[PDB]
Amino acid sequence: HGEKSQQAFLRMRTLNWYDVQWSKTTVNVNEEMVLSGKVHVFSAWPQAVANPRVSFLNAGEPGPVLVRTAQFIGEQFAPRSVSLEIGKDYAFSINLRGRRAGRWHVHAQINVEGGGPIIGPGQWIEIKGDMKDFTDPVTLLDGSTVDLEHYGISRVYAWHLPWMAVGAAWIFFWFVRKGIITSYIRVAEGKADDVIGDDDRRIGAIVLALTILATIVGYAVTNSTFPRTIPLQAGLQKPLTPIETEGTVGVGKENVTTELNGGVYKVPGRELTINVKVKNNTSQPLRLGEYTAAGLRFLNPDVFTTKPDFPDYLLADRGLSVDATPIAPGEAKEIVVKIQDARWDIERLSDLAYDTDSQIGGLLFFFSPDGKRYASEIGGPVIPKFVA
Amino acid sequence: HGEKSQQAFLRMRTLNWYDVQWSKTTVNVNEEMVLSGKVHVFSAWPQAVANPRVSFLNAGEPGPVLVRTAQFIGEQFAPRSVSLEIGKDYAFSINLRGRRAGRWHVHAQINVEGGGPIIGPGQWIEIKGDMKDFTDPVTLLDGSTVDLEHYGISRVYAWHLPWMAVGAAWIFFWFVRKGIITSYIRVAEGKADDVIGDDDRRIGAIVLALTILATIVGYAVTNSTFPRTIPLQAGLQKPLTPIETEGTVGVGKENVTTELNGGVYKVPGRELTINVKVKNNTSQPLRLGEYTAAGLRFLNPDVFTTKPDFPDYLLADRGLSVDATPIAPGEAKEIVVKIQDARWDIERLSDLAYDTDSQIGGLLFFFSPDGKRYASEIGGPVIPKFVA
Amino acid sequence: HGEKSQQAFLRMRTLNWYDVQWSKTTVNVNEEMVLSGKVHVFSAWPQAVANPRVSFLNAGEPGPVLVRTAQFIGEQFAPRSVSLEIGKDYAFSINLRGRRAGRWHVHAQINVEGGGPIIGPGQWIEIKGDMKDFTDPVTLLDGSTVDLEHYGISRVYAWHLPWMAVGAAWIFFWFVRKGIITSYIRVAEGKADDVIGDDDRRIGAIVLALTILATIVGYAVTNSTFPRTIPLQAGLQKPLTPIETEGTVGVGKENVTTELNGGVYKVPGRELTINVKVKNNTSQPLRLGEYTAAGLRFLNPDVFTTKPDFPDYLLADRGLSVDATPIAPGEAKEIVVKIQDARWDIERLSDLAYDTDSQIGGLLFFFSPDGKRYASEIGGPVIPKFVA
Amino acid sequence: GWGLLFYPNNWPAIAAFHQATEQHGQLMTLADLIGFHFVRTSMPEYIRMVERGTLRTFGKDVVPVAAFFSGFVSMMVYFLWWFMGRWYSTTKVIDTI
Ligand SMILES: CCCCCC(=O)OC[C@H](COP(=O)(O)OCC[N+](C)(C)C)OC(=O)CCCCC
Ligand SMILES: CCCCCC(=O)OC[C@H](COP(=O)(O)OCC[N+](C)(C)C)OC(=O)CCCCC
Ligand SMILES: CCCCCCCCCC
Ligand SMILES: CCCCCCCCCC
Ligand SMILES: [Cu+2]
Ligand SMILES: [Cu+2]
Ligand SMILES: [Cu+2]
């Protein structure tokens, strides 16, 4: 929810989210919803952000309002850190479960080890029900089923609270047997021996023996229960399998290849007149229909006749100026694209002038006469236009 | 010899040794034996172990009982560190020479810079003869031949021992000329000037001049001898050339591709019921015949009719359950493999439950009706079966 | 100009410069000259030098005698750090501009992040004119044109010098109002209160208020001017595009592949009898014509009938002994190459014996009956021949 | 002088092992050959932490540069350890421990 404050050029040149979907907008407690999508790793990964070689898939939400039951990326179950190769596209899906009643903004998020959090598109999720009705539940290896919402808390209390009580009792015993001022005066008057001296040391040794006995007894008792335990499972996972369809820029014999030749963004404003050299390379007449910068879906009004079902704060149905002319096939030509929408300034992408690298990035989507979609990665320097 | 204590999942998911051979089991002093083999670098290299980008080939033996005259890996003479690329197969060979009489367990070993030692198969070598009969020998650039067993030791003694004697003489001279208690009392009584004062400083300066003269004379004399010397030769070697036959998983147009779909290892026990999805991809009917985990050759009794020549502690002729059905060609099917042998528990691979990553690895070997062998890399999570 | 002192094996096994040209040898003040060339990144990059993953293209000259107006590498404008992939060839060009009259030795230089400077070929540039006639000039985003030789210096002086004067005035005021000896004696005599006490503190607070007012006024005034500024633009650039013609070792279906099988360099001397296994692989009868080690163009007298235009200190027209026999096509044979020239010793490449890795590197150039040139990378261990 | 005298006084004992030998078409010192021949288990080559070359070493002065460097870094260490030896020579007796 804080992606607005992140730097623009880092947001648009690290991960390019697309095809992000939320299974349900309104969910009940203990009801499952699936957040899925695809992410493209920018080829020109910034030096500021470390390599995505170590990264973690996460659900961006205000706390555990939705419990994550399972998540997959690269066709792999990914509860641990995964590796993202630069220039590849990956498909992810997170199985969430309603826990807390309210209206929450749930994002798709990937964290890079040396970079930090990268926040994708977010959607408002309405959760109905009561917190006390929430149960996970999970099954153990032995076959027993437990409820992770409440399991183990009673044992933790029963082991921790008595020891805190014992410590408090020890402190109060020594405080009432010997006063603070009284013992201080006694020690200062040279006689710091009648303040503590056996039978006092006997009481201390009795307490220590009882404590050691309880620790050994407690350790042995909690070994009879749970006799077979395993260490924490950790470590980077095996390499993921990227997407291969169709494309999915960089894959297949048919693909569009775009190259930025200069751009102008009005500061302050909302325009982005970018000159794109499109080689089309494919077989069916292709027309630009969408530009996802940092998730912001700037859709070309002509191609995208029907506005799709995407979070309004990112869905801009005004990615104007393509050429109104199918460019494919085989032709390499330069087209002028005029991105203009208030969302470009709302999402602080217009703050690219404040960044130390005035460079844009994202994905260009071209569409056939039919529904076939071809993705192309666009990125490069742009020049700010300082207006009054 | 200490590979048993190393963690199981690291042993089976870093290097997969195969085709390891020892030229001779019984060798004499000054007699040459060759330890050769092939090693496969696991594709899913663990995060715990650093990259094999910097690694060293070594012979695992209890000290220099066998002198290494030459060693090669990747078709390169490798006296220095070499680079191993993840997923490749390399052929190595070490030319050993008998030095110490006895029965020694000699392993093949590769050390990774940030990981540590990886120990391969080991064989008992019987060495007959006497230590005093051992000569290397090596030849210099000028053509002279020296014996590295004894060369240079006399000069080192003749330079080191006299200087130690000189230091002892200096200490004893100053100790007898001025006593310890006597000089301490003298210094404490204010007169710390008649304890040391010229002619004492004259003796000191004479000693220093003689020492400097000897150092200069010694340096010049040892420059007349050995007038042409070179600095220590160090540095990582050029990239190695992997194996390309036939395969050698990952090479060639004909190869088996296996994928683990769950496994069960009895703890405590010796079983490993692993479900393997075999795609065979090749042209000749292929039947699973061998599974090398950490060098442990679990051979399928049917295919491996004759038990091969391999260290008994690793050679398990009971890699049971394949399908008793040739799977190739073109067919992708799921087979159930039941690895079961006491060596699985002896070599302490059953301790996979103690590890922080319950994941297996290794190589699967498939054989044609003829002797052609196809290698496939298997690896993935497995689930412990807690027996009472 | 200090490349002679750098270690030989690092010089010849990091970057192999070729096709280096200087547009003009004699240039005037405010006149543009272009230094261009191609560089090959050695496949066996030394461990001592860090990866060329972060590197910077630079012009090696004694200070800003020539102002760099623009520089390109990998078909990219490169004012910032760039990435060089090991084994690739890159084309670079630097647009210089005469600034200081004299005769200067201008090199082509690339700096590696963890390695340091790598110095390429250098040529003497004669610059005529006067320093005071030098103007850059550059144009701003608003369209105004400024002269970088003098722009901004007046403002820096007008802001810095008055504050230094103010500090000096403050010091002298407090030094004359209260003497050093006088105030020291006063403080030591217990009365360190009549040395500093209001009205003194009033003068101090007046000075502080005026200073804060000037800082705020100065900050606001310099915000009215230059109301639109941007932060420093920094960061590694996008990956470069290597050369693909023709080859350009490692590219194309037609290429020579050479492998060193031992070498002998006379120490001290100038010879390098290297045994090269040439596979020719190409289609036209190829004959060795050039060996660029560290830029030193050792040209074979036969093939190179006309001595080319290249700095004499590197151009050696005596790269003798190829075989006087066209080797291509399809034939793999071993040829003996006898590099011998005084430049090999002048450039301290004969000091390879002093290095910790007696290994050579560089590029081998083969030529067709016509002018087509095929490049091959040669490198490997060589053995010094100690002569009297 | 404690630093400048280290290499010269050690040269007589290590020069014989710096003689060049040819091993399988590769130059190796006698010391390198000795280390390579007599196998040490937990001692690979990559850990040797020796002079492996560098782009701003200016040849024929590596040993003089290193010897001088150890020469004056010793002065700091000599000072600190002289005073540490002074402290270890204390006769102080504390009342309670
Ligand atoms: C300190 C008095 C005795 C040695 C005098 C001498 O000739 O040695 C100096 C020479 C100076 O080095 P250089 O001749 O430049 O290179 C020789 C390098 N080695 C010794 C490896 C052949 O050798 C050293 O490196 C010893 C350490 C410095 C002492 C001043
Ligand atoms: C030439 C520099 C002398 C520095 C020592 C000195 O004057 O005393 C200061 C302090 C207190 O010493 P003090 O109790 O006065 O005893 C005087 C006897 N010595 C001179 C041996 C410390 O001594 C130290 O503990 C050593 C500080 C430097 C190395 C980190
Ligand atoms: C004082 C003479 C210097 C001789 C050449 C440089 C040797 C290295 C000394 C630091
Ligand atoms: C290891 C040195 C620690 C300090 C020794 C005691 C210092 C005594 C101060 C008078
Ligand atoms: Cu949000
Ligand atoms: Cu052993
Ligand atoms: Cu120069």
Distance CA A384, CA A354 (A): 10
Q: In what order do the strands lie in the sheet with C102-112?
A: C26-28, C116-128, C102-112, C55-60
| Nearest-5° Cα angle at A374, A368 to A376 | 135
Q: How far apart are CA A308 and CA A296, in angstroms?
A: 13
With beta carbons less than 8 A apart as the criterion, state whether A286 and A258 touch.
no
Within 6 Å (CB) of ligand 3, which residues are found?
D 61, 64-65
Pick the residue whose CA is nearest to atom 3 on ligand 3: D61
Distance CA C258, CA C261 (A): 10
Distance (Å, whole) CA B134 – CA A155: 68
DSSP notation for B61-92: -SSTTEEEEEEEETTEE-SS-B---TT-EEEE
Alpha-carbon dihedral A257, A258, A261, A265, rounded to 10 degrees: -160
Partners of residue D40 in chain B, C-beta under 8 Å:
64
Residue with CA nearest ligand 1 atom 22: B229
Compute the distance between CA of residue A25 and CA of residue A19 in angstroms, rounded to an integer.
16
For atom 7 of ligand 4, the residue with the nearest CA is D87
- Inter-residue contact A59 to A68 (CB < 8 Å): yes
With breaks defined as C to next N over 2.5 Å, after which residues does chain C break?
A: none
At C31, the amino acid letter reads E
CA A167 to chain centre: 42
D4 — phi, psi (to 5°)? -70, -20
B61 CA distance to ligand 6 middle (Å): 8
Calpha distance C260→C339 (Å, rounded): 14
Taking the C-alpha atoms of residue B58 and residue B56, their distance in angstroms, rounded to an integer, is 6
CB–CB contacts below 8 A, B to C: 34
- Enumerate residues 202 to 221 of chain B having a beta carbon within 8 A of any beta carbon in chain D: 215-216, 218-219, 221
Nearest chain C Cα distance for residue A379, angstroms: 10
Any residues with Cβ below 6 Å from ligand 1, and which?
A: B 215-216, 219; D 4-5, 7-8, 11, 60-61, 63-64, 67
CB contact under 8 A, A141 and B383: yes
Residues of chain C neighbouring D49 (CB-CB closer than 8 A): none
D42 in contact with chain B, both atoms CB, cutoff 8 A: yes
Q: Give yes or no for a contact between C277 and C332, defined as CB atoms under 8 angstroms apart.
A: yes
Token code pair at residue B247: 């395969």
Angle at C143 between CA C140 and CA C149, to 5 degrees: 40
Phi, psi of A336 (to 5 degrees): -110, 120
Question: Which of 134-193 (C) contact A at CB < 8 A?
Answer: 141-142
Name the neighbours of D, counting chains with at least 3 Cβ pairs within 8 A. B, C
Do B305 and B258 form a contact (C-beta atoms < 8 A)?
no
Q: How far apart are CA B55 and CA A209, in angstroms?
A: 52
- Among chain D residues, CA nearest to B146: D30
HEC readout, B225-254 = CCCCCCCCCCCCCCCCCCCCCCCCCCCCCC
Six token digits for residue B194: 């008649």
* Contact across the interface for C234 and A357, Cβ inside 8 Å: yes
* Tokens standing for residue A172: 């109060």
Residue A25: how many CA atoms within 13 Å on its side-chain side?
Answer: 5
| φ, ψ of residue C155 in degrees (nearest 5) | -65, -40
CB A250 within 8 A of CB A88: yes
CB spacing of C235 vs A47 below 8 angstroms: yes
User: What's the gap in Å between B200 CA and the centre of ligand 2?
Assistant: 28
Q: Which residues does B223 contact at the CB level (< 8 Å), separation at least 6?
A: D11, D15
- Which residues are A33's β-sheet partners? A96
Burial of C56 (0-12, 13-18, 19+ CB in 10 A): middle
Return the residue matching tokens 């404490």.
B188
Residue given tokens 């990964």 in the structure block: A45
Burial of B16 (0-12, 13-18, 19+ CB in 10 A): buried
Using N-to-C axis directions, what is the helix angle for B200-224 and B153-177, rounded to 10°? 180
